[PDB]
Amino acid sequence: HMDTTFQAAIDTGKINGAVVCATDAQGHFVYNKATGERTLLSGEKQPQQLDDVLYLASATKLITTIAALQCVEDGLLSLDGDLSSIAPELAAKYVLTGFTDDESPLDDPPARPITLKMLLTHSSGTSYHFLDPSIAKWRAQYANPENEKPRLVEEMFTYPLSFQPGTGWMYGPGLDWAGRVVERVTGGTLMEFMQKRIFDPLGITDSQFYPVTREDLRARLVDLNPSDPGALGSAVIGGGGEMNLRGRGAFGGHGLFLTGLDFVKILRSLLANDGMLLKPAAVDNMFQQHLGPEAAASHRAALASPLGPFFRVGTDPETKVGYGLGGLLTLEDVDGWYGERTLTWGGGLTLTWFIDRKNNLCGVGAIQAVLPVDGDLMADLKQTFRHDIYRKYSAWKGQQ
Numbered sequence: 288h289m290d291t292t293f294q295a296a297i298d299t300g301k302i303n304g305a306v307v308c309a310t311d312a313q314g315h316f317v318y319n320k321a322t323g324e325r326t327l328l329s330g331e332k333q334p335q336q337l338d339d340v341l342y343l344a345s346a347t348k349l350i351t352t353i354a355a356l357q358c359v360e361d362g363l364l365s366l367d368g369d370l371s372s373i374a375p376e377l378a379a380k381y382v383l384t385g386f387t388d389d390e391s392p393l394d395d396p397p398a399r400p401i402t403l404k405m406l407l408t409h410s411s412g413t414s415y416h417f418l419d420p421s422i423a424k425w426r427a428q429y430a431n432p433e434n435e436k437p438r439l440v441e442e443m444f445t446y447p448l449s450f451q452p453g454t455g456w457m458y459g460p461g462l463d464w465a466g467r468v469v470e471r472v473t474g475g476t477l478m479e480f481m482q483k484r485i486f487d488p489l490g491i492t493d494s495q496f497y498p499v500t501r502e503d504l505r506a507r508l509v510d511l512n513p514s515d516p517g518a519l520g521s522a523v524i525g526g527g528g529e530m531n532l533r534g535r536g537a538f539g540g541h542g543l544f545l546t547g548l549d550f551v552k553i554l555r556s557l558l559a560n561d562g563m564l565l566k567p568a569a570v571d572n573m574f575q576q577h578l579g580p581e582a583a584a585s586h587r588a589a590l591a592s593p594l595g596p597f598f599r600v601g602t603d604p605e606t607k608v609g610y611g612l613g614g615l616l617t618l619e620d621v622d623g624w625y626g627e628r629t630l631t632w633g634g635g636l637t638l639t640w641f642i643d644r645k646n647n648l649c650g651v652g653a654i655q656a657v658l659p660v661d662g663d664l665m666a667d668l669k670q671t672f673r674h675d676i677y678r679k680y681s682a683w684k685g686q687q
């Protein structure tokens with residue numbers, strides 16, 4: 288269970304603490320717990336607190352997903368519309384299909400336009416070079432000889448597509464592109480849009496994209512410490528290969544900092560479907576399979592690949608899953624755990640979240656790890672959270 292499992296990891300020195308926040312739609316069952324300690328830049332230790340500012344890493348993707356769907360409500364975008372005009376950098380990408388045996392690249396022009404739905408579901412073709420061996424080999428020719436200049440989204444993610452748009456699945460910068468599209472069609476920064484449309488309606492004021500400049504937030508950053516004087520989020524990412532340090536502007540793929548308490552407000556608004564962020568029908572559409580037949584087969588292949596455990600977010604290999612607007616989507620019940628159409632993703636190696644509408648539960652679990660981060664231990668700690676919270680929910684339901 289969380290209490291003894293987290294304490295054992297603290298005792299071995301592999302984590303400093305954790306923040307866990309879960310709730311049902313109405314706030315009847317609520318579980319909030321901060322465990323352990325944080326270290327300040329001065330070396331002073333403090334108990335972990337529920338309003339400590341956390342690095343969301345790819346938990347950002349859910350929030351960016353919401354922002355893009357709000358633009359859809361506004362009429363500024365559509366899920367299936369052609370993005371070539373707003374994002375010509377995407378339209379100009381070609382599809383890399385393989386290499387000759389003399390290692391010459393083979394590519395083809397894109398067969399169709401890239402759409403917002405493709406960006407939100409990682410079926411556009413844009414792939415992380417560190418997850419896609421083919422794109423990683425292409426990247427190691429057109430080498431940045433480390434021009435160290437800070438780069439916008441469009442200047443960071445310059446690789447060709449990994450497959451014809453709509454026909455595959457690979458995790459990538461789809462939401463960094465979607466965030467840029469939001470900035471272009473609204474005429475403001477992503478932080479401005481999110482603050483007005485997501486944070487203000489929920490009474491959230493303690494959030495920033497990297498770099499965190501606000502003095503009050505920096506005083507509460509878990510990741511501002513002697514192991515991380517740059518507050519880069521190294522502990523969450525598992526090691527510093529920092530995109531954060533080399534970036535310029537907001538990165539909707541991974542950039543946000545937020546408290547656990549504020550993150551669960553976003554989850555619960557979706558779970559309750561209370562109209563604070565999106566109209567109910569728009570939310571319902573998030574919880575559907577949005578991969579086509581070829582993309583779905585590509586998705587299942589990645590889930591069976593050596594990176595599958597990361598892409599499965601703790602779900603069992605026998606459970607059928609798809610990808611919704613915002614994360615992985617389960618397609619069948621697991622009795623005692625996630626109901627069908629549970630949406631789930633995470634950040635780094637240390638953070639995971641879920642929204643289970645059928646069983647009426649949502650929650651985020653964010654381990655605060657010690658460098659160097661033990662990846663196998665993080666998976667176990669995340670699994671303990673994902674199952675222990677349901678055991679706590681059952682006990683509470685039994686006591687009513």
Ligand SMILES: C[C@H]1C=C2C=C[C@H](C)[C@H](CC[C@@H](O)C[C@@H](O)CC(=O)O)[C@H]2[C@@H](O)C1
Pocket residue numbers: 345417418458524525526527528529530531597598600632633634635636
């Ligand atoms: C749900 C999780 C799934 C993932 C899929 C593949 C990876 C393991 C992700 C972690 C990436 C991160 O560790 C790598 C970063 O160093 C990226 C970089 O800075 O180079 C992970 C995270 O995005 C969250």
